[PDB]
Amino acid sequence: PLIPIVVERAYDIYSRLLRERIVCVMGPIDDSVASLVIAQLLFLQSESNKKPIHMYINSPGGVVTAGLAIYDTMQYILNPICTWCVGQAASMGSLLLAAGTPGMRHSLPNSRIMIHQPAIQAEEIMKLKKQLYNIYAKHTKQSLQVIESAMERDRYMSPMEAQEFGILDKVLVHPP
Amino acid sequence: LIPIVVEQTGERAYDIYSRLLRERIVCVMGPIDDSVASLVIAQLLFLQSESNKKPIHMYINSPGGVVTAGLAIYDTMQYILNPICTWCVGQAASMGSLLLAAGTPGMRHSLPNSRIMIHQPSIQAEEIMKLKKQLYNIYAKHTKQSLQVIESAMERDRYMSPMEAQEFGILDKVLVHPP
Amino acid sequence: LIPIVVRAYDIYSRLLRERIVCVMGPIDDSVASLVIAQLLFLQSESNKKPIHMYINSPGGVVTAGLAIYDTMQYILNPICTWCVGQAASMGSLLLAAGTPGMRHSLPNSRIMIHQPAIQAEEIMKLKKQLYNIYAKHTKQSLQVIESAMERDRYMSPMEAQEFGILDKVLVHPP
Amino acid sequence: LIPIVVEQTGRGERAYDIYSRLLRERIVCVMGPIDDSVASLVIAQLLFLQSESNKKPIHMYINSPGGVVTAGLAIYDTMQYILNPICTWCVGQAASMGSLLLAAGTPGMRHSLPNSRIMIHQPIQAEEIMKLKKQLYNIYAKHTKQSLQVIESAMERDRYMSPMEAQEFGILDKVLVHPP
Amino acid sequence: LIPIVVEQTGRGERAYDIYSRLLRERIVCVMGPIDDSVASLVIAQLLFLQSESNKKPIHMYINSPGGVVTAGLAIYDTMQYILNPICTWCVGQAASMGSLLLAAGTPGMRHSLPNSRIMIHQPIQAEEIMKLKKQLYNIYAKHTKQSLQVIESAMERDRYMSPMEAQEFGILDKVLVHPP
Amino acid sequence: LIPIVVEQERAYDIYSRLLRERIVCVMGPIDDSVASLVIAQLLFLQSESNKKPIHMYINSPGGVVTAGLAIYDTMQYILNPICTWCVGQAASMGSLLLAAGTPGMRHSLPNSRIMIHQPSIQAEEIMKLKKQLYNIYAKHTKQSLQVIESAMERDRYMSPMEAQEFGILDKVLVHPP
Amino acid sequence: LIPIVVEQGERAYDIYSRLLRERIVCVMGPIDDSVASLVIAQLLFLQSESNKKPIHMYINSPGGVVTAGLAIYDTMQYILNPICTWCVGQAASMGSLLLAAGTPGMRHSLPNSRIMIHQPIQAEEIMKLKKQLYNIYAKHTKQSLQVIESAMERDRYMSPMEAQEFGILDKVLVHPP
Amino acid sequence: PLIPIVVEQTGRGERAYDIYSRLLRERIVCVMGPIDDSVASLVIAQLLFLQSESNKKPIHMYINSPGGVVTAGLAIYDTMQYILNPICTWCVGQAASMGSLLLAAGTPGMRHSLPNSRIMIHQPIQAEEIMKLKKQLYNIYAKHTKQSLQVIESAMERDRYMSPMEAQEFGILDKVLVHPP
Amino acid sequence: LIPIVVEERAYDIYSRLLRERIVCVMGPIDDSVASLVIAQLLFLQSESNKKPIHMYINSPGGVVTAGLAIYDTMQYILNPICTWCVGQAASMGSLLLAAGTPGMRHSLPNSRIMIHQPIQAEEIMKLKKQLYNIYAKHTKQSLQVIESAMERDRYMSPMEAQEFGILDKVLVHPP
Amino acid sequence: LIPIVVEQERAYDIYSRLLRERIVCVMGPIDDSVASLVIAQLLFLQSESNKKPIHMYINSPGGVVTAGLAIYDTMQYILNPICTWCVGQAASMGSLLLAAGTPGMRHSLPNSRIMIHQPAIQAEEIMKLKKQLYNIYAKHTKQSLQVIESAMERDRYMSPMEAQEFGILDKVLVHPP
Ligand SMILES: O=C(NCc1ccc(Br)cc1)N1CCN(Cc2cc(F)cc(F)c2)CC1
Ligand SMILES: O=C(NCc1ccc(Br)cc1)N1CCN(Cc2cc(F)cc(F)c2)CC1
Ligand SMILES: O=C(NCc1ccc(Br)cc1)N1CCN(Cc2cc(F)cc(F)c2)CC1
Ligand SMILES: O=C(NCc1ccc(Br)cc1)N1CCN(Cc2cc(F)cc(F)c2)CC1
Ligand SMILES: O=C(NCc1ccc(Br)cc1)N1CCN(Cc2cc(F)cc(F)c2)CC1
Ligand SMILES: O=C(NCc1ccc(Br)cc1)N1CCN(Cc2cc(F)cc(F)c2)CC1
Ligand SMILES: O=C(NCc1ccc(Br)cc1)N1CCN(Cc2cc(F)cc(F)c2)CC1
Ligand SMILES: O=C(NCc1ccc(Br)cc1)N1CCN(Cc2cc(F)cc(F)c2)CC1
Ligand SMILES: O=C(NCc1ccc(Br)cc1)N1CCN(Cc2cc(F)cc(F)c2)CC1
Ligand SMILES: O=C(NCc1ccc(Br)cc1)N1CCN(Cc2cc(F)cc(F)c2)CC1
Ligand SMILES: [Mg+2]
Ligand SMILES: [Mg+2]
Ligand SMILES: [Mg+2]
Ligand SMILES: [Mg+2]
């Protein structure tokens, strides 16, 4: 994990991407990742409350409450958010992908998307699961019944299938 | 420890990998995982913003690794407009050979003693097969071989020499030195 | 802790400014990557000035060693190789691959051409690549190389000189 | 934690870790076990110091239980390759390859502090192990001026020598309490 | 995490970690176990301080359970080699090699705080272990002014001395609550 | 080391001797291995006599729910009266087994502690199991299911007297009558 | 410690050996080559004692190694004997395949068991194994390949009643008739 | 992995055997799990014991193995050829690598698989030595399958399993059985 | 799990083989294996000082002094010793194979034999010289040939080992 | 796994059979556990006969000095002649035990190696133990303390012939006479 430095002032390359309003959600989501992503989103809003923010997602998912913290922050800030699926968006990753601004949810052609979810009481685990159903229903425009049925299936969707389902808007090979 | 080198601009000190990045060289050395993919993708996108026309060099010495991470790099290579020169040094196996093959036509290179493997050295069963079919389609597109030939070749647990890989359509040039 | 010398450089970076590249310890992909980056950087600083490669290595990963070997042949520069301590397995291949006339050992070094999850056929193909490379740089026949590599032993610098692995055994400069 | 010190130069004030400051005084430390990593660092320092001046003495401080023989021999060969006088100093102990480096200092310039201990005993195929051992015998014979027979016999004994005994043996020249 | 402090210099402000700042005041810390790495660092600091001034006192703070005997002896020999007066201070404890270093301070300049504890008891081949032990007896005899017989008997007892008892024994000179 | 005892002569390890007196021990955490052993013992004792009572000694913090349910189903499958005894504690699945003894034959010693709370696969499946537990506790305690669900949310133990009033057990005994 | 029991001359058996004597074979726990070897040896031994008498297979398993499960399955089909399968606790993955492979009419579950047909080398070989499972489930459940494939994609358990309706088992029993 | 005990009626009364020892009394030898020197030693000891009990009666070898150490597999193979007895081999679950070699080395006509087994002839010191061992395997497979060395070499390069029917056609086994006839 | 066989007396299968005068040297040789092999050889000599003993060898070698302890015991007892190489005999394993009674050293057809060998330096060389002397005695090759051959990191086939003088017969089945 | 042998019938593990022949093995490192066992065997053999020789087989790198001294003292305490045999090696405390056999009855096989060199307590106590070893070697070898001290400093092995000349053993035997 040596991070290359680029000259524009010298920045590590992730800090340079942040200057272009790009936030990376790569790898598992936990409280530490959520904290960082939230800090970046709030910083970018203060730099400009109108300019779009790009969120790059390559994630197998992770901790549900951490994912929900990022989701709530995405909705709290005013900015348009362009989400991009590269590699995969599974579990909480696909929720974040779906939560991008309508018209601005993107996937590359070979990505895979999973809405399936591969110590607390049983009732609390179900309450969290219902929160996920409600969020997916809101952003995909599918019924709760369809979301519940689809999330039970242990499978990935192609980008085209995810587009038809309402998780994303555009499948792009290159810019138009 | 990464050595530091000085470039004349006054003088600026770079670690040697950052200096290579300044020359439009991106390294894909070692196993491919999400962390490596993230770094390679960031570098490719940065280089495109510096110039959407100038070639980018991708050095590949890799046993492969995580398929979805490899596909993320592959999709980024196709997304950016730039010519990409791929170079096989040491080995390109599994996802490494896919990236090698995905360089711009005419600009896929190997050094003379490298070894290339398209075999994948041994989620639900159906999903594993879907990924495998995606690999077949990508190799078919860039090698110009049929799906039948690719499927048969990938079943064989072997490496190809650079000349063999050239004949197969994985690369274009086997170079001892510059022309 | 790496000492700093005086612009302030860590001592390995200072050696690199003097066109010295170190191949100390086991060779793996990470070492190969670093050595290759240094060789290519030094070529861009000057495609004519000699590069010094210091080798103290028990060997390591064959494909990583071959990546360094191919880079040594790719760049135009004269490469002076130096054996200090030992050059075994892939280390001795790199030593032998220096520019003719510029392959050196210190007097107490030891050199080994013996090699102390892939298919049997692929292991043999790699071994044959090593035979061909040693034959080319030592000027010995394939038969002699194959026989010598079977023997689990080190050569002294003088014996390695007679074999064609190196050119000069030096106590001090002339 | 390595303390940082400030030195006054021709270009102003510069901050060095204390080992880097010692290197500026032409002092090279060989403390702890000798392996390829230590040899690499010591060799780089010796070659750097030669380039700063091929005439000025270099001080080598040795407190070592020994270590890897080929790594020790790499340092030894570098000591002989550079032109500079090398003052060796035994502090604490010089055992196995450490005592070889101590003995390899420039004649007249091999030193020990009074309470140091020196060991020439040494605490791949059989033939190759013997070849290395014979190389050590030859090097000790050359620098101590003792016969091969005496060196071989002495190296078999699992013991340390005092600085005075090491002086009489030809490993070092001076046992010093303070400067003259 | 080591706090940073700011000093005013000829060029403006310089930031030192607090141990480096103490070194600028000629204070060398010997806290924790003594091994070759600690000895190397302490020796480098003592030699640096001698080069800054061969007359100004050096303060050595000792809070140590002891450690490696040859490493302790390397520090001891360096303390005797440099010309400078050395004030030793026992804070917390000085046990085994720690108490040897404490006792080796310049006569009149060996100090303890009131609640410290001092141990001269000490918590390779048999002959070599005894030779080292005899070196310790000789050093304690020299600096405490007690006979070899008394030192040998005292070192057999698995116990600590109070600062007052250590003063009476000849290990230290002053037990201080605050400056005079 | 398990001591050996002699019966009038045959030598048994002491647990095997207890088994001869129709005593089955459920001590420690419940997992598939414990369930297998307990089930084998219950079925063996039924074959020796389908009428004679079986004593089940329970000192358990609970454990794997499906393993506990396997024991529970076996207790209901065999015809025999089963006397359950709480010694030390019966928590989580342990208290379910205690409650599942034959009515009138569920016992605790005076200093035992009983917990019906479950100290904290897909979410839906975790809830299905939890609902199965509610139904079983309701059946054997004779409390409405609404009361069971509320009580199981409370992270606490009951004394033997409180567990008796709740319908988990029938008798709190210091010694035999 | 495995308790020892006495059978009537008196002979002392460990309790699992006593069960084997009653023609009961336990498949409790993860299935791997070692478990398969033991189960196969027991089935073949029981066939040699009598090629007509029923054999009882008790299943409490989360599944395990597919080829090991298939070795047991093939042995069940090879021997002539009627095989009564019993689900206690759970039968998941390969466990539910063995349950379903009992003799028609003789596949049983206790009331609180859970059954899963979902399944929690090169890609082509993994798919070939998966297709073998589809074919076996189709044969014993009498469902179509399409229905089996769809059902196996769903990460869920079935109740015993739902498994009965699906064709995995024949009887859900609280006690003997 | 507690091994059940079974009781047999003898001339002197009752004898208790662990179930594997009981199978050995019926001339059944198990090769289950990875093959290493320890497994080879036990299998070899059992084959030689069974030969001494009768040099004519068939021996059954049950194979469920991913393979393992090549020299250990070859030790078992050589023992199978050394004893005079007919050896019936049975593939249950899988026979991969050295496991499939042992399966193929059963007496002609007596090599069996159950219907859902999988067979692999692919194989998932100095380089020259590794090749010498590999050539020994080619020669053994050629002898027992009756295929050419060229066909064996090509087939062993492919990282795949064969079904029992495909293994039958290849010459690795003779019969694929659901139940006895 | 070691199977038990009945002869009534019940023996584990290795103990049954010992009743047939078979001693197994399978796996690495260390002091514990040497102790067991030596005890078995001495026991078999006491049962009969004339009847042959069979030693089965499948070993990568191991501790030199432990191997030499077995070797010395083989020479001490009067009995003919038939050695059998199954799988491999490498390093000390091949020394034991070669030390069988002349005419009674056997290999199965697919075994591999290695005489190459994959404290202070002087003591390591003394042990190595002891091995040279023992191989020279039992193979009838010169010290020079043994030293040269042991330097080569390779295995011999049974036929090559026969020609070298390590063994006498390569057998597919009994005659 | 220790093989079992039959004597004319009683079945012994092979080490117990050797003990029946008055053979005690000291193979492997010497620690308190090994000492305890050897001492028990020596005392048992003395009670069977206080006159018949005992054979001690030594293949040992040495080990704990006080444990070795416990065995040594027991060898001297019992009346019996003790034949010591070096097979493989006798190093450190192993060579002390070898040397402590009855005069005329200390044996080595031809390829054995013997080392008298010794490859938390206070320094003084370590020296006291070392002096005890010097005294014991002097007594049994008949060499002076000065010669023993000098020889023990040398990190080397002796051949059986050299050990014979030194006074550690009496006979180097290829086979019985
Ligand atoms: O201070 C600000 N906004 C101004 C600002 C300016 C520069 C930066 Br950097 C960060 C925030 N806010 C940011 C919003 N925050 C609430 C919050 C917190 C949070 F974790 C998530 C949210 F969506 C929202 C309360 C305080
Ligand atoms: O904003 C830009 N490009 C401009 C730019 C300028 C400087 C830098 Br540094 C990085 C990007 N894009 C780059 C393309 N990106 C989508 C994307 C994301 C991705 F992960 C892979 C892709 F191939 C493409 C969306 C945002
Ligand atoms: O960009 C350059 N050369 C110019 C240059 C200038 C400054 C630096 Br720093 C590095 C390279 N090349 C360097 C050679 N590279 C191919 C290559 C790659 C490689 F890994 C090994 C090789 F021997 C050769 C293709 C691109
Ligand atoms: O370049 C130089 N000398 C000049 C120089 C200037 C500044 C520095 Br920093 C280092 C060396 N040499 C130094 C000697 N080196 C060979 C060598 C290498 C080595 F590892 C040990 C040696 F004793 C000698 C070849 C190159
Ligand atoms: O070079 C010097 N002294 C001058 C000097 C000036 C600045 C610094 Br920083 C260090 C030393 N000496 C320092 C003493 N050293 C011998 C030595 C070494 C040692 F490890 C301990 C000692 F007590 C003494 C020999 C070289
Ligand atoms: O074999 C018998 N009963 C007779 C018997 C006699 C001696 C013994 Br020991 C065990 C059982 N049954 C017992 C009931 N069993 C089904 C069963 C299995 C099970 F795991 C739990 C149950 F509650 C019931 C089927 C076969
Ligand atoms: O020997 C027999 N049957 C007789 C018998 C008698 C007592 C016992 Br115990 C075991 C077997 N057969 C049984 C079937 N076996 C092949 C076999 C092996 C196998 F692993 C699974 C099978 F379904 C079938 C071949 C040998
Ligand atoms: O002693 C016998 N045969 C008789 C016999 C009788 C009962 C038993 Br149990 C074992 C062997 N032989 C058996 C064959 N053996 C050599 C051998 C050893 C071996 F490991 C594999 C082989 F194929 C052959 C030599 C001694
Ligand atoms: O007591 C006997 N022989 C008779 C005998 C009888 C039954 C048994 Br069991 C063991 C030995 N000897 C056996 C040989 N032993 C010396 C010995 C020991 C040894 F470890 C290896 C040897 F080659 C020889 C001396 C005592
Ligand atoms: O009771 C006896 N001897 C009689 C006896 C009879 C049968 C047996 Br078995 C063991 C001892 N003694 C044996 C000697 N023992 C003292 C002893 C103990 C010891 F550990 C070592 C010794 F050298 C001596 C005191 C008790
Ligand atoms: Mg103490
Ligand atoms: Mg709680
Ligand atoms: Mg799942
Ligand atoms: Mg493979």
Numbering used by the authors:
A (entry chain J): 57 to 64, 71 to 180, 192 to 249
B (entry chain I): 58 to 66, 69 to 181, 193 to 249
C (entry chain H): 58 to 63, 71 to 180, 192 to 249
D (entry chain N), E (entry chain M): 58 to 180, 193 to 249
F (entry chain F): 58 to 65, 70 to 181, 193 to 249
G (entry chain G): 58 to 65, 69 to 180, 193 to 249
H (entry chain A): 57 to 180, 193 to 249
I (entry chain B): 58 to 64, 70 to 180, 193 to 249
Anything the authors wrote about it?
The mitochondrial caseinolytic protease P (HsClpP), a serine protease in the matrix, is responsible for the homeostasis of mitochondria proteome by degrading misfolded and damaged proteins under the physiological regulation of the AAA+ ATPase chaperone ClpX2,3. By consuming ATP, ClpX recognizes, unfolds, and translocates the tagged proteins into the cylindrical chamber formed by the HsClpP tetradecamer for protein proteolysis. HsClpP is highly expressed in multiple tumor tissues and has been reported to be oncogenic in several types of cancers.
HsClpP assembles into a tetradecameric state with fourteen ZK53 molecules binding in the fourteen hydrophobic pockets, far from the active sites. Inspection of the binding pocket shows that no obvious conformational change was observed for E82, whereas ZK53 binding leads to rotation of the side chains of L79, V148 and L170. Extensive hydrophobic effects are observed between ZK53 with the adjacent residues of V148 and L170, and those between the 4-bromobenzyl motif in the ligand and the alkyl chains of I84, L79, and E82 in protein. The activation of W146I HsClpP by ZK11 and ZK53 was substantially weakened as evidenced by the increased EC50 from 1.6 to 42.4 μM for ZK11 and from 1.4 to 11.8 μM for ZK53, while activation of I91W SaClpP was significantly enhanced with the decreased EC50 values from over 80 to 8.4 μM for ZK11 and from 44.5 to 5.4 μM for ZK53.
